[PDB]
């Protein structure tokens, strides 16, 4: 009934908002990303991630209640939604996941140089072409500064960075 313009953008913000939800709540579960596939009478949400049974819950208790929550939120009907999960291979090739793991290491209280050396070691032995991480803020100090850790070559300009790099 509504225009396809606002249809599409509502689908876009729909994706964005549920992505915000899921990178919030499934953050400690090795989240990476999600994908609705539209269907007649149905719509489906894989979650590319690592800790699969953890996001499921017992007999999928967690995913069931998540379906109920998101459905009640978006005023969908029951049965309109199905969720799945995907133990993605090459865990190192997911900037979001590696950053989240780094975050939990930090909150645990791990040495940050140690952590970053370890993370980029893990990436480049997972078999990337170039890795990069960076910190900025208060760091064993009272004044702002940064650090950096990297190896291999990278790029900064072009459709190459629009496509190849994960950020």
């Amino acid at each position: 009934l509504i225009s396809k313009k606002r249809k599409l953008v509502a689908d876009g913000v729909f994706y964005a908002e549920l992505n915000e939800f899921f990178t919030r709540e499934l953050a400690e579960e090795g989240y990476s990303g999600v994908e609705v596939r539209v269907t007649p009478t149905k719509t489906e949400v894989i979650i590319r991630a690592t800790r699969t049974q953890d996001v499921l819950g017992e007999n999928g208790r967690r995913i069931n209640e998540l379906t109920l929550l998101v459905q009640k939120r978006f005023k969908y009907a029951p049965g309109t939604i199905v969720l799945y999960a995907e133990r993605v291979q090459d865990r190192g090739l997911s900037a979001v996941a590696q950053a989240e793991s780094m975050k939990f290491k930090l909150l645990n209280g791990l040495a940050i140089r140690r952590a970053a050396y370890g993370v980029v070691r893990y990436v480049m032995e997972s078999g990337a072409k170039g890795c990069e991480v960076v910190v900025s803020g208060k760091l064993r100090a009272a004044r702002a500064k940064a650090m950096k850790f990297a190896d291999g070559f990278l790029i900064h300009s072009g459709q190459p960075v629009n496509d190849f790099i994960d950020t």
């Binding site: 396809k4 313009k5 599409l8 007649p40």
Partner: protein
């Protein structure tokens, strides 16, 4: 039967392999058609500032959403119709059919 199928997407190559398997299905089942009526593409433009606050120099960014729309008018009996509908559901692309 006089249906009109249409697609309203942005993912170009997705839409196009969709249209290709669509049309070859239609022609191998030997059903009448028109071609893929390719509408003019519509670019949704949003032009605003990069800067969240007010200061710094003035600098404008223009984000784009490129929309491609296609449609064909068809005739075919109900069984081939519904098989065509329940097949060729490729994700990312938006679809709808009408009749009369």
């Amino acid at each position: 039967i006089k249906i009109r199928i249409t697609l309203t997407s942005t993912k170009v190559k997705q839409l196009e392999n969709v249209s290709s398997n669509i049309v070859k299905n239609a022609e191998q089942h030997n059903l009448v058609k028109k071609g893929p009526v390719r509408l003019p593409t519509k670019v949704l433009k949003i032009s605003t500032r990069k800067t969240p606050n007010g200061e710094g120099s003035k600098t404008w960014e223009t984000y784009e959403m490129r929309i491609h729309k296609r449609y064909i008018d068809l005739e075919a009996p109900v069984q081939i119709v519904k098989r065509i509908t329940q097949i060729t559901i490729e994700p990312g692309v938006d679809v709808e059919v009408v009749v009369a």
